[PDB]
Symmetry: C3
Subunit: 227 residues, 3 copies
């Protein structure tokens, strides 16, 4: 049920908020139109995360879904977050590597299906079908990471060393972090309740902050964002 994890939601709300404030108070006198895009994209990520986490702490983003043989607490707000949030992170990577519009669109579409599909899964009443949606969603994710790791790295090789290396760190961090989400989902309250909603919220919390604030820090503090 939703009550004991309140603390992980509260620390998450706090961390996203401060992460937003810090980024805002760092790109203020930035004139380079390129760095400007990066700060805008990167500042918005934690800001959206902030609002959704707060809706979870306040209980608004929690819903109850009947499946298996009981009433399960499903925090839907995560998808609302990730829906805009994951595409933004991808965009940062695309700008850094100067990706083709076509691949950016394919990536954004793949990302949309990933979250949309995972949302349908977390809300499906037929326990067994939830995992079908999980598989489709995970397939979409693998497609995204495949392009990031192999297609983007290649595009990064044509940029100057600062960009290429900062991209490498960002690439490694997103590939590692993103792939932890589906596993958490599968073993948490949205799938096989192996892990309690308590510990689950703590995992997502560490993953989200790292994937946003951490990712944000690595990027916004490198010279890579400058033309």
């Amino acid at each position: 049920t939703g009550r004991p994890e309140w603390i992980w939601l509260a620390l998450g709300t706090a961390l996203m908020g401060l992460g937003t404030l810090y980024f805002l108070v760092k790109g203020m006198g930035v004139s380079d139109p390129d760095a400007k895009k990066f700060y805008a994209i990167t500042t918005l990520v934690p800001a959206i995360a902030f609002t959704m986490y707060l809706s979870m702490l306040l209980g608004y983003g929690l819903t109850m879904v009947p499946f298996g043989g009981e009433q399960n607490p499903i925090y839907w707000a995560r998808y609302a977050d990730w829906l805009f949030t994951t595409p933004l992170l991808l965009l940062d990577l695309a700008l850094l590597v100067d990706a083709d519009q076509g691949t950016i669109l394919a990536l954004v579409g793949a990302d949309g299906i990933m979250i949309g599909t995972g949302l349908v899964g977390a809300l499906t009443k037929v326990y067994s079908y939830r995992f079908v949606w999980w598989a489709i969603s995970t397939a979409a994710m693998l497609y995204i990471l495949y392009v990031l790791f192999f297609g983007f790295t290649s595009k990064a090789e044509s940029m100057r060393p600062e960009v290429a290396s900062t991209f490498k760190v960002l690439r490694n961090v997103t590939v590692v972090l993103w792939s932890a989400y589906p596993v958490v989902w599968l073993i948490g309250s949205e799938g096989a309740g192996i892990v309690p909603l308590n510990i689950e919220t703590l995992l997502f919390m560490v993953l989200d902050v790292s994937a946003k604030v951490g990712f944000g820090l690595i990027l916004l503090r490198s010279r890579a964002i400058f033309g």
Copy 2:
């Protein structure tokens, strides 16, 4: 009610999936950044259609709406599909003809209102109002087809013969197919139940596959997508 049409939903899911796989396995070694956009846009259409159709087969995208004087089964998932799907098809046409940003925006907006409006209609409890929404939606569609047929054809005349002719076929196919949707809606379970939900799902199924996979095949197999 929703059970007998299961087969049309299943074949639709299958056809969209295979259509997605085929397109994916055809634009793999494509380097031309132009063709790349077309494959990305065109591959995403059937992929989204795939997920929504599956939600209908699995019963998730079906809801019940009280109107007239009974409980009517309304597959809402179609709008979720068409919401992203119809705009994408329009974009393919715009890229092919190299449309102005302003007209692309007007077209996307008109398309958004068309599906949004039709969604409101399919879910409205006052039987008589459903048709008001239908009219507004149909008006938006007519605006889109008017621009495609007269405005776009003109823009196509300035491209090389392969583009102009492929555009012509695509234009004719979308104008004919798209206009069948409102009629089906009006005579099906969403409006006047003249046609059973059974036969309706079969019509949309033929229309959707043609309008996506068929449209996709005609486009992706022509040299028109190359610069």
Copy 3:
């Protein structure tokens, strides 16, 4: 409750519709691709407003929310409207002033959070929390107006006099009008019921038409939209 304000909804529906028709019947023979964008963006605003207002008149966009100690009537359709509508207006201003992509993205994101946040607030069951969302939403708005008034005006100074001055009028009108929305919300049925839903709907109606049709008239009737 929702019944007596029906007239403000009906006049609003009428005014948005005629405002859409007028704009459509004014940008018909416009060839300048720049003016074309402005007409497209500006025509879509009242069109969307039209559909949402009609959903409110017809009772579809009204929902009931329990909070405080009673059943309150909340017209949710406003957010659906403003969600696409406010960003479009911002885009008109950005195009006029030729804003950086980064600031356009930050503005669109800030706007999304503003409406998304206000929507969550209008639907939150814990009376006290509604105002938290209100504050966050108002903070997002202030961020937008700050950039419009100080950042954009500066960008406008680099354009020719017709653009700079038309921008000034548009700037003043949006800053004044937009800031009236949060106050209305705070004293209306969504917050402290100081003002009845009757009078509230009349205020939003005057604000919406001015902010869209009025804004639209000032812009589309100046030479500022031409390159």
